[PDB]
Every structure is written in structure tokens, then in C-alpha cells.
Design a protein around this ligand. Sequence first.
Ligand SMILES: [Cl-]
Ligand SMILES: [Cl-]
Ligand SMILES: [Cl-]
Ligand SMILES: [Cl-]
Lengths: 255, 259, 255, 259
Amino acid sequence: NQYDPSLLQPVPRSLNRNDLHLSATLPFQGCDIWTLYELSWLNQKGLPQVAIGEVSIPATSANLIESKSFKLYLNSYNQTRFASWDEVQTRLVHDLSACAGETVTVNVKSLNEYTAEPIVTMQGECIDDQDIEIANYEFDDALLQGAAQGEEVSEVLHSHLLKSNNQPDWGSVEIAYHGAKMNREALLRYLVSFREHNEFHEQCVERIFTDIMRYCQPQSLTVYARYTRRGGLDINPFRSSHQSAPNHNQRMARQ
Amino acid sequence: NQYDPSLLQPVPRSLNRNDLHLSATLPFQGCDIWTLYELSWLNQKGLPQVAIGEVSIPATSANLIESKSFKLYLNSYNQTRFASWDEVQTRLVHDLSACAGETVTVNVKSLNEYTAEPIVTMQGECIDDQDIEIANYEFDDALLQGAAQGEEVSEVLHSHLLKSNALITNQPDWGSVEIAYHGAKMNREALLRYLVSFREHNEFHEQCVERIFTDIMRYCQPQSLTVYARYTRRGGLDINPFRSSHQSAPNHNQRMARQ
Amino acid sequence: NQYDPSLLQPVPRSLNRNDLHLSATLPFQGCDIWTLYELSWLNQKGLPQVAIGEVSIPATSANLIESKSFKLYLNSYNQTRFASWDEVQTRLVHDLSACAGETVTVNVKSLNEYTAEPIVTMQGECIDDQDIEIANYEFDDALLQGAAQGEEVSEVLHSHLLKSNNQPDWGSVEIAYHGAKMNREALLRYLVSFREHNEFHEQCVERIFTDIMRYCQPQSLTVYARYTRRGGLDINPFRSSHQSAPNHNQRMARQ
Amino acid sequence: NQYDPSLLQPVPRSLNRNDLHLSATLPFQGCDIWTLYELSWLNQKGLPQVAIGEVSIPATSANLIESKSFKLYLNSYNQTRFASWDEVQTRLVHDLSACAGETVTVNVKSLNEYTAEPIVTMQGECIDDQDIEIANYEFDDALLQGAAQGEEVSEVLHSHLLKSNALITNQPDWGSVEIAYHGAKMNREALLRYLVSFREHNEFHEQCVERIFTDIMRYCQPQSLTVYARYTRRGGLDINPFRSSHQSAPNHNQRMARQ
Ligand SMILES: [Cl-]
Ligand SMILES: [Cl-]
Ligand SMILES: [Cl-]
Ligand SMILES: [Cl-]
């Protein structure tokens, strides 16, 4: 198995967005940030090289990249000789851009760039410690009905309780908004109800964004989730009414 | 599927050790340290809980625990209600100890315990930055023949270049390895070629560490030796086998960059 | 006063580096991150526009930019009509790159990109709460002699107590390293001794880096300081043995 | 230079108000909220302390405090040893109240109190995004003549476009302003042109807010009005004047993006 760009499989963003009752004109902007922990190839002399890739795919791209296919594509680098680290970054930009349908940003970082980098947590207030009982795990977006009745605020909330299905995927999510203050029990119950829900990580973030916008009507909204890796890759979708990218890319405890 | 300890699959250590032709007395001591990044369950009221586990299995245990089965076992907690964090930790100790055949240690930590914990590298000198050509990756232990010619020295060397055989594991697995020894100085080209050759071998993880230890012992004959690998996670957990002539365990569990 | 690039004044990085006994080959890599809080100009129709600029200047550039001159240069935009926000970003890149001597990165952000952005603190452990007496404020780099005797660690430490002089400037600083564990009292005393010391912000960060490297000999070192603004601009120098840029740009409480 | 309360410079409010031709009874109530971002001093053992102060001065005080003098006064704390944080807060209240001529409120907060505090924007609709041409920036209050033609409405409007006269302040100063009123609906083009015209005026900060209030009152005649500006800091502190027919103060001190 030598280097093989045809392993990459796009999935159109439209599939789920149509499900969310979205027009071609988006309520949000943003990007999908991917971390590639397994990136490895051979140098020109056949000596293995290892790196961590950091990739940003614009949320306006026609397609996302299916994660298993991304992994298989990356494995095709492992036994292939490349002229330099620059050639590797160039090939990644080229192939991932073609697949997504829009220019993708790629940084290929040596492992020593991570030495003494701290693990971080999310910004704002954690909503997870609530003494409440969950009697049903079925997804219910109506859990947000009347969820923001409070005074006008700007607030950042987060939760580590995102899970979606067949093996489970795990995430933390940060919600920053300007609008009527949100009921934290309703928000927590809403997030927990994704547990048996099936969908891609990018799709969950867009669903949270559009449900909050519909039910809660904030003036400004940002939703940023950081998911644990599968197949050596993690995905961190960011969707915002006013912001193009998150102001930090740093790994969380489970990542 | 809810809590199911029957999902755990023991593998006798002797299966792979037999092929190393050891002495009745194990040449090394040590442990297998696992990090469980996915640990989650429900509290008594049904609210999800999340944690990171850290498990140490003695290298003297009769059995290791097969990694896929360990993943499936942990997944069985996800939808199960437990009365307390103590209960979860206690069951982990019970079930994993039963599987391995010896008492295992388990720490269940809240995510906040990791905030600000730094990513680490290994001790000593990295040997990866060499101007050499490699074209044949087949496993060759003979690459170590005559590898230690030096004056007797104490050093610590490490490499980030361990990778498994893709056919054997289906998807490649990845690791870094740290080798600390006192003995005739080891040729770093020979050692690097040898480590790289694991990508065409049939042993990885715990078996790879024991193979490296036994091959270095026989070819290089050091007075003291420690071989410690830290592998990237597969299925939400990672394995970090430590084997040594004189030492029991690494001084911590801190994660490396790819982990 | 219309737009005037000649207001920009470079200062060579060599001035201080020569003082630190540095070769032309640097012990560190990095960048100076600037935040421009006062950026304003007129659109093509004469209607004022306001934005926050984010600028990164490579630490390899021949020159830094003197802060008062940067402010005066930016004021020259205030009464000048520009075709679009893109033209403004283009002119900033052009002029700042010419002044620094290397390509500078510029992002011009609308104010609504900051709505509901949280204030952050530094990573790792704060060293400031120590019950110790300071009898002298004179700069002493020898405070670090024998300061790292401890076991091999990877650690992140920070302090909010950086001050340098004529009006005072204020900063917080984050030190991430892999090496022998540092004595936190010695480090705190060392940082406090900058109080009456005179130098540019970039110069302080490089001095901390080189003093720690000389006295403490860590395998890997990163020093990142975030200073409070003067004249509407703040400077955030980042210097690292292995890292090119910080992984977060976010304002601290005093910024 | 160590602690020196004589550095504080009072300015009588009447100096500028005289030019507004008010009634013996002030038409508004309110306060000037200041944020002190640079506050630092030494503890009894000489170790530096850092904090952010928040000060509220009643709009009825005889005097305002000149901003440069306030900066210099605060700088005088930097090298001075104080026994406790309480002592620092107490002296601030004493000295600032003496200067202003009325009791001022002072909160001294540790930096950790700001962690996670979000940046805010103002209430209501931003009026800045208009397709209009402006070429003459001279101050013109007459821009408000006949500006409120509407049916009576309650609305809140804001603009980020306040800037001072560069010659007068030497270096330009910057602010956003929020105007909440009940009355005949205000023409937004007229209001924007008027606000933009402050860049060629001789009044800013507290005086600008009072001028805006008095001009809107006379030209537009609303039943109720509040004018609140938040200015970017100069010399490490910022001023946020609030003036209202019916309201005492804003509900908080949260910083805006440029602040
Ligand atoms: Cl518990
Ligand atoms: Cl390390
Ligand atoms: Cl105190
Ligand atoms: Cl807001």
C-alpha cells in the first residue's frame, strides 16, 4: 500500500443540513478542526518520520471528510517515501482540499512541539454537576422549549457529557452566547439526550447550534465541541454566528 | 449492552514467552500500565459520569488482557447505573484482577485532575535523527549482533519509531520506546534499524517490549537494563509495558504527544 | 493627518540580543503577538469603521516595531478613506512587514467577533502566593543560580507580577519547561527583580528565556508573556526552543 | 514616587455644565463608573499585589476626577507597602471621595475574579451599519433638528463610533454609546451623523455623555431617556458615564471588546 488519495471519501454537508431545515445560506460560520495523532511516512532515505497533523476545514466546504476514510488515506503514507516534511504538508493540503471542495489549512508539527504543553479544560461554567434524575435517553429537542427565559446575559457554559452512537464517541461542548439567560437543567438534559442519537460529530454541533437558535433565540451564539479520537483522528467542530475560528486549539483530558 | 465482565479476554503470558525461550526464572520484572480515556457510566439517578482510569497489571500475572475485550468490557459500563465512584473502582479492581490472575491496581480520576497536566517526552537521547537509509523492513534480530562494542557506560536512549505490522493488527499501532542500560555502549544505527524492523514482525505491545528486552540481553549483554514502551491508544485505551532487570515501574503515567 | 507609513519606526532585535551574548543563530523561535484595540478608519463613503487588529511578527525579523510609532501610524488611518476592510488588512500587512523586515500576519476582526468571549488566565500553577519578604528591587539574574536542582519534570508555571519601567508596564508570564524541577521562590524573586529594570517587552521575554536556559538548563523551554496595553496596543512575546507560536491568543484580566 | 493623594486633580462639574445651560435642577441622575486595570501595590513584606478596581462616582458629586491625575495617583501605590487589601480599598474610598466631594464606591477585586468573565456588547440595535456618506465631521447639534418624527416608541439604540478630537486630547479617545428612550421615533441617520460629529468637538467622556443627553432632550423631547457611554481606557483606566432621566446606574461593569 503506497500513497493513495482515492481512499478519501467525502460526505456532503447538505445531507444533515437539509434535515435541520437550513437554506443554502447558513445561520453560522466556522470550521472543523482535526487532530491527526498517527501521521507517519518515510523520508527520502526510507527512515520513518512521525508528526502530529492539525487540519482546519471551512464549514462552508461542500463536503466533510469521512473519518474512517481519512484514517485509511493517512495509513497510505506510512510506507511511502516523501522528499521532505514540506512535500507531506503540500500533499495533505492538496488532497484534503480536493475532497472537502474548499481550501483546507494543514500544519504538520514535530512531536517536540508538544513537550510540556498542558492539558486544558473548557471555558466558562461546567453545567454537569446537578442532582437530577434522567428517566429517558431518547433525543428530545423540545427539552429546550422555554429554556431561555432569564435576563439578558453573555455567558459561557460547558459540559463533558456528550456521547453519540456503532461504538460510542465522546465529547465535551462549550456554548457561548449573548441572549436571555439559559436554564442549565434544560440544557444539560438536552445534551444528555444525544446519548442514543446517531449522527456525525459535525452534525451534532450543527444540531445543537440550530436547536439553541430556534428555541432560545440568542443574539450571538458559538458552539464548540471537542471529541475524543477514533482511528487516531479527532474532530472538533466550531460553529458561530459571529466567529470564524476558535481562539484556542488545545487538547482536553480525554483527547 | 450493560455491565458484562464476561467480555474480558485473558491471554496467558506464557503463550508468547515460550517463543522467547526464557529461563524458568523470568529475566525481568515490571508491569503493564494502561490508561483508560473513555471510562463512563451512569450514577444512581441516571446522570452520566466521566473519568480517566489508570491500571497497573504486574508482569508476573498469569495473563494479560486482550485490548479489544478490555474496550468492550469498559463500554459495558456506559449505560449501567452504579451507586458511587467507589463502586466503579472496586468492580474494576475485582474484574481485572480476576482476568489477569493477580491483583491489579486501579485509579479512577475525575477529568479536573488532569487540568494543567503537561505532555511529556522520554528520558535521555532520541536516536531517530540519523542519516541512514532503510529499505528492507523485515524483522531481523541479528541486526543487534556485535552492537555493543563500547566502553561500559550508563545511558538512556529513546525512539518514537515503533510501528506494528499492518496485516497482523489490521490497522497499524504506534509507540515510543525508552531503553536504559549499563553495559558496553550500543551502536545507535544498529539499534534504530532493529527497532524499525518491528513493522514486519508479528509481536507488538507487551510482546514487543519483552522481545526487545530479551534480544538486547542476549546480543548486548548489559549489566542492567530497562525497556519501556508507551503505545498510542486503540479503542480508547493505551498500553505502556515496562520491563527491567532491576526496576519495578516508571515513576509516573504522564502521556506523550501522540497518546 | 492622512495615512502615513513613514510614522513606523523599527528597532533592531540585535540591540538587546547582543547584550544577552547571543549569536546570529538564535536559541529560540517564536513571534511577537500584538493586539490593536484602537484600529479605526473611514470606509469609501466616509463612515467610520472600528475593528480589533491581531498581528504576529516573527521573532526572526530583523526589527521589532516601536510601540509609540505603531500607535501614531495607526492613528493615521482614522481620517482616511479605504476601499474595503480587505484593503486595510493589505496595507497593514505591507507596511508592518516592511518595517519588521519579514512577512507579518494580520487579522482585522469586527467587534462582534468578541461578543461573549471569556477572559482567560494562564496555564499551569501560579507561583505568586508565597509568603516571602523582598528586601531589594534591583535586577539580579543570579537569583536563578542553582534554581533548578529537582527531579526531571515537565511543568508549566506562571506569575502576574511582571512590571518594568517612564510610566510602568505590566505583565503576566507563563514558563513551560522540561528539565530539572525549578525552585519557585527563586523564580518568583527573579521575576520581581525586573521591577525597576528598563527594557522593551520583547527584550524582557528574551532575557527571561536566556537566563533560565543558562542557569537552569532545561531540555525544552517556552516563555510567553502577555502585557497590558499602552497607547491602545498590547504586545505578547512568545519564545520557545521547540514551538513556533502559542496555541492560544486570548486576553487576560488586565489586558 | 510613593503614595501621594495630592496628585489627584478635581474638576468642578459646573465648569462644563454651565455651557449646557441647564436648569437649577439637574435634568438627569447617574454615575461615572471607572475600571482600574493597573492597580498594584506592595504587601507589608514587599511582595507585589495586583488587582482590578471598579469605582462609581455619583453624577451629583461637585467634582469629577481628571483622568491623567487619577492614573498618576494610582501609580503612586505601585512602590508603596500596605498592610492589607482592606487598607488599599479604604484609602481609595477616602481619597477619591474627598476629591469628588461625595462618597464614591470602590471594589478591589483579585484577578481570579475575572476568569471566565465574558466580553459584552450593548443593548438594542446597532445603528452603525448605514449606507450614507459623511464628509464633514464638524460638530453640529442641529443635525438633531426634527430628528424625532415617529409614533411614540420605546427603543434602545447603540453606536461604536464615538471618537474625540485629536488636537484637543492630543491622542484620540474612543467609545461606544447606548441610548434608551421612550418618545417619538428617532431618525437613525440624523443620530449617527450627530454622534460622528463629536470627533470635531471639544467635549468627550463625561461631558460628551451630558451633551448627548441634553441635546436629545431638547431636540427630540422624549418622555424618558438614558445615555450611557463606555470609553476605551487611557493610562490604564476607563470611564463609563451613565446619565438618565429615570435610572440610577447600569446593571453591571462588564467590559466591551475594545475596552
Ligand atoms: Cl460518588
Ligand atoms: Cl518531558
Ligand atoms: Cl490582605
Ligand atoms: Cl453582550
